[PDB]
Design a protein around this ligand. Structure first.
Ligand SMILES: [Zn+2]
Ligand SMILES: [Zn+2]
Ligand SMILES: [Zn+2]
Lengths: 171, 171
């Protein structure tokens, strides 16, 4: 992957006005994130969860299902954020499986690149890797895979930087 | 129950600055809701789900658990909103169980009250009843019940009115 700064005028998840976007963001990220989305408030259906993850439980399936079946959403954005307390090198004992399992697996699978980086740059890399893995795994959900095969769904990854108030798309 | 307009300078979930509040809101409600919270952005841990519900699923349990065990939160707010598409009318087929079950149970349990109202007033009553039920059910959870009996947790209910740009506490 590479990071591409977004231009707010032409975001990949808004090539046409009027349609609703499922925005999947993190519980410890603020509203300030959506100011970098390129979407007006009335085009946003917002799921906000631990580490902007979708794990295969009833909440992920029901939210995906309602978004596709009732709102006929054609775009999903997974928005990670720099400074995230959940997608970081600090392993918090209060964080349950499978959220903790996803993060352990990322740390082991990407050990080579992560091992060469100090704390702040390591945590930024882990936010980005978490967004990529969430985008890849949501594409393999049964409901998303059938929509993608009809070219009736796109899933996008982005990272928001609180400090610069800018978003970066994962390409 | 009765509705009490909130004053932003004296919200029951912020009697002292610095501590984090778990804010449970709806996916089809906007950030505009949090402007009525009386909280600065860095005191908000936001869980945003179908119909501002907590059902007994891994996501609800893990988010509650991370909030209590890792963030040591002392206040939970369940925020419903007038004009909600999920807590409205009768059956949406796109809305899965147990979300659909909660709403059917509210429609049956409060049939007498709902029958006394027209459609728009019926929808508003269903938003308010949903918040009260979510607050009552969350209090009965094993983790919440132990914390409440130690006076180390409060759960609050509120409803946000987009038209008046005000929140109302459920007393
Ligand atoms: Zn986060
Ligand atoms: Zn927001
Ligand atoms: Zn709603």
């Amino acid at each position: 992957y590479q990071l591409q700064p977004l231009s707010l005028d032409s975001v990949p998840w808004r090539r046409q006005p009027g349609q609703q976007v499922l925005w999947i963001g993190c519980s410890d990220s603020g509203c300030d994130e959506l100011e970098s989305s390129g979407l007006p408030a009335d085009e946003i259906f917002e799921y906000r969860s631990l580490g902007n993850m979708m794990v295969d439980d009833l909440s992920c399936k029901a939210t995906l299902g309602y978004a596709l079946d009732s709102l006929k959403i054609r775009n999903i954005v997974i928005c990670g954020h720099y400074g995230c307390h959940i997608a970081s090198g600090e392993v918090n004992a209060g964080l349950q499986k499978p959220w903790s399992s996803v993060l352990d697996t990322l740390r082991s699978t990407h050990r080579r690149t992560l091992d060469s980086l100090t704390g702040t740059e390591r945590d930024r890399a882990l936010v980005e890797l978490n967004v990529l893995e969430q985008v890849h795994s949501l594409r393999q959900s049964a409901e998303a895979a059938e929509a993608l095969q009809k070219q009736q769904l796109n899933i996008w990854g982005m990272v928001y930087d609180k400090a610069t108030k800018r978003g970066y798309q994962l390409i």
